[PDB]
Design a protein around this ligand. Sequence first.
Ligand SMILES: CCCCCCCCCCCCCCCCC[C@@H](O)O[C@H](CO[C@H](O)CCCCCCCCCCCCCCC)COP(=O)(O)OCC[N+](C)(C)C
Lengths: 57, 69
Amino acid sequence: GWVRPDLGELSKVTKVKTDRPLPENPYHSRARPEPNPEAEGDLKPAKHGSRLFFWTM
Amino acid sequence: IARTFYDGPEKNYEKTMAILQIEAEKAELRLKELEVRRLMRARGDGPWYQYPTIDKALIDHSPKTTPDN
Ligand SMILES: CCCCCCCCCCCCCCCCC[C@@H](O)O[C@H](CO[C@H](O)CCCCCCCCCCCCCCC)COP(=O)(O)OCC[N+](C)(C)C
């Protein structure tokens, strides 16, 4: 009672039901380094301007 | 002459005080700014001197014809 698979059937992506637990860290990755914290707050004008040599603005 | 062409000593005195305060604050700001630049360039933990790396969104996380990546 064996039916030969039709053209296009053996190349299907199928689903598999397994009792094997899904691996957590398959790449064996280290802990990722913490990022630089953030930019936060409101933008205030520069204190006493550019503060270049003699420029008051 | 004093009444017509000049002001009292208080005006110049307190204008000098304001000018001195502004100048001293600018000096301390300049020194602090140099120190902050040095620390940020040495450690790289600040918003400045942030040199580009590779964007992680370019990585393709799909099966690769071979199980071992
Ligand atoms: C009784 C006989 C003896 C009296 C002798 C008196 C000696 C004085 C005469 C000499 C003149 C003084 C030289 C002018 C320098 C002053 C410049 C400046 O300091 O004055 C400004 C004021 O401006 C003045 O108007 C100066 C004007 C002087 C212009 C001189 C021109 C004279 C030339 C003569 C021409 C005559 C006709 C020509 C025919 C061809 C000050 O600005 P301001 O910030 O506000 O004042 C702050 C003080 N407050 C707040 C109290 C007001």
